[PDB]
Design a protein around this ligand. Structure first.
Ligand SMILES: OC[C@@H]1O[C@H](O[C@@H]2[C@@H](O)[C@H](CO)O[C@H]2O)[C@H](O)[C@H]1O
Length: 407
């Protein structure tokens, strides 16, 4: 596949375009594809793939040259895929977008290799703090006030735990999901101005005061009756958003892409949701994980101009407004974030503020899956030791480094 000679806006000619993305982003992906298909001759044939299957599916399809036209991937997985030639070089096409500066830059950076560009943002997924205002009220907490520090997060989680009720816990930790753990825990380190990787992405820097404070917090909750919801230790990632949605959890980090479901449940007469940025150990410091899926045109596409038509279309602020803002979801285009949510739910305005304010990060390493997301990764073992066992954070950190720096 090559993007040589394709039109600046791509080709809309009735081609069937295959697109892969992952189950956690299903609500947003269906909205995007339906909007494109209702307005173009080209038609996107969408496949939603379970989060933990996407590596095996991409690796196998790459070997049989059966990758889809458009492959969306978790921004932490993209650098590896881009480095191994999974994507068609679309530098010219990306650099030709008149609004490139407006697009979520972490998604473009994820697919950059020595300045060659392979990806654009597909769906932004940021981590935020959610809490159950009904549990807060019952526990004697001010339901309007989310946690401004990790210490206040522990204090609020402990007050809800002390309700001492079957099925109610202060917080929840995705104990065996390295990907949910980086998403939920990294922002508290960045909030404090600390780093999780070194200057050149080849070493972990998790042996720092902020990360220790975060792990201290979750250990305290692990040692509190009803501190962490049943299933925390065994949570694979397949159910980690369920206990909060089911009203069983006081307060935890959570995906913005899962918040529209909560806001719908509240409209139906369910429990009221609070949303705020994830805090540092340092009070009033905040950040987020600028995650979700980026997308590019696979090396196997026979329809590069037609796939580019989809990428081009979605980058436009009007498209972003239709498929994200108008649906209550966070856009990938800062112009859309600043203009399309003026009478939106203030919690959505809160979510957007964390992106507009610029203090979140997208981590980039070609070894990110092996070091972090993978089942039994050195990062998962680091967290499991610190929260539920004993650990040597210097040793456990160096075990992450040894995977990031492997040649
Ligand atoms: O994977 C890193 C980052 O976290 C969010 O994805 C989560 C995924 O890892 C877990 C396991 O399913 O559930 C998702 O919430 C985000 O989309 C991604 O960039």
């Amino acid at each position: 596949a090559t993007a040589e000679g394709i039109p600046a806006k791509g080709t809309d000619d009735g081609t069937e375009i295959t697109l892969w993305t992952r189950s956690p982003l299903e609500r947003q992906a269906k909205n995007v594809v339906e909007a494109y298909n209702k307005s173009h001759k080209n038609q996107v044939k969408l496949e939603i793939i379970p989060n933990d299957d996407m590596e095996g599916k991409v690796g196998g399809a790459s070997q049989t040259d059966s990758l889809p036209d458009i492959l969306a991937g978790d921004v932490v997985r993209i650098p590896y895929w881009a480095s191994e030639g999974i994507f068609t070089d679309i530098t010219k096409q990306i650099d030709g977008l008149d609004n490139k500066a407006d697009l979520q830059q972490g998604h473009i950076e994820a697919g950059t290799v020595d300045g060659a560009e392979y990806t654009l943002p597909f769906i932004t997924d940021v981590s935020v703090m959610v809490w159950n205002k009904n549990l807060y009220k019952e526990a004697g907490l001010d339901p309007e006030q989310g946690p401004k520090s990790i210490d206040q997060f522990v204090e609020q989680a402990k007050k809800v735990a002390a309700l001492n009720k079957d099925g109610v816990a202060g917080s929840y930790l995705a104990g065996q999901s390295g990907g949910a753990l980086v998403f939920d825990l990294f922002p508290s380190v960045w909030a404090d101005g600390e780093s999780v990787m070194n200057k050149d992405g080849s070493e972990a820097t998790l042996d720092n005061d902020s990360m220790k404070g975060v792990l201290d917090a979750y250990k305290e909750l692990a040692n509190t009756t009803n501190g962490l919801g049943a299933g925390s230790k065994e949570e694979t990632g397949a159910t980690w958003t369920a206990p909060f949605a089911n009203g069983k959890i006081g307060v935890m980090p959570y995906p913005n892409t899962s918040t529209t479901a909560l806001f719908d449940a509240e409209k139906d007469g369910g429990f009221e949701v609070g949303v705020a940025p994830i805090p540092g150990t340092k009070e009033g410091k905040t950040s987020t994980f600028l995650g979700g899926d980026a997308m590019g045109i696979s090396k196997d596409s026979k329809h590069v101009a037609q796939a580019w038509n989809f990428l081009y279309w979605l980058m436009q602020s009007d498209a972003q407004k239709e498929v994200f803002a108008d649906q209550g979801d966070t856009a990938s285009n800062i112009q859309t974030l600043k203009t399309a949510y003026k009478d939106a739910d203030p919690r959505i305005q809160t979510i957007n503020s964390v992106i507009i304010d610029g203090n979140g990060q997208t981590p980039k390493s070609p070894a990110f899956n092996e070091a972090f997301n993978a089942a039994g990764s050195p990062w998962q073992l680091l967290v499991q030791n610190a929260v539920w066992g004993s650990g040597d954070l210097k040793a456990d950190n160096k075990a992450v480094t040894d995977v990031l720096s492997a040649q």
